[PDB]
Structure 1
């Protein structure tokens, strides 16, 4: 099992930050933690690296699990964050943007991420 760390980032308009990967799936930004990094610290870094968005962690969510196309099981730990700014795609990505919850529900590729979105919304401060 390979650990991952990422963020469910919202802006002041309560829109969520989504990214479209190389396989064309809309998901949340996440990546591998470096040795010595807390998962929260790694999530903030991955968000910045993959979307060019500076975010601040509000509170922890919960981990999701799945097996990627290469047969590797992943356990990604998520954090609710707040951020602003236009996104920037890093090499590999096929899309990125801010989305209303309604739009996200219609774009997110996986069930694990839909539930994550709803819980994040329940805990997002007004």
Structure 2
């Protein structure tokens, strides 16, 4: 299986960072860890590479699993992160921004991501 590292990033206004892929789906930023890289380090780096936002890991959430369109099993480990500043649309992306929990609940494309959002909010320091 191929591990992945992703982030549910929140700013000081308790808004979450979402990106819209080439297919028009709103999702959380995630990527592949490099050799010898901890998943936490990978999450920080992938968030920067995928959104242009500098973020830090606050706490671990939980992993999600699925089989990619090519038949490969993926297990993405998610982290609750705090970030600031405005994002930028990376190559292929069709949208990016900060959203309130209510707005995110209405935009997230993948069903499993709704649960991630709620657990992230429960653990995010008030």
So what's the TM-score if we normalise by structure 2? 0.96
Q: CA RMSD in A?
A: 0.9
Deviation at 1:70, TM superposition (A): 2.4
CA–CA separation in structure 2 for the residues paired with 1:85 and 1:118: 23
CA distance in 2, matches of 1:22, 1:67: 19
The range that moved more, 60-69 or 4-13, is: 60-69
CA apart distance, 1:71? 2.5
Q: CA deviation at 1:82?
A: 0.4
- Aligned residue-pair number: 126
SS in 2 for 1:116: helix
Distance 2:73 2:108 in 1: 20
Note the C-alpha offset of 1:19. Answer: 0.6
Matched, 1:102 2:102: yes
Q: Secondary structure at the residue paired with 2:65?
A: strand
1:48-70 deviation per Cα after TM superposition (whole angstroms, max 9, x unaligned)? 01101000111000001122222
Alpha-carbon offset, residue 94 of structure 1:
1.2
Runs of 4+ in 1 over 6 A off after TM superposition: none
Give the Å deviation of 1:72. Answer: 2.1
Gaps of 5+ in 1: none
Distance 2:93 2:18 in 1: 11
CA distance in 2, matches of 1:97, 1:68: 26
Unaligned runs of 5+ in 2: none
C-alpha distance after superposition, 1:2-59 (max 9, x if no partner): 1110110000110000011112111100000000100000000000011010001110
Distance in 1 between residues matched to 2:89 and 2:70, nearest whole Å: 24
Match of 2:15 in 1: 15
What is the CA-CA distance between 1:74 and the residue it aligns to? 1.3
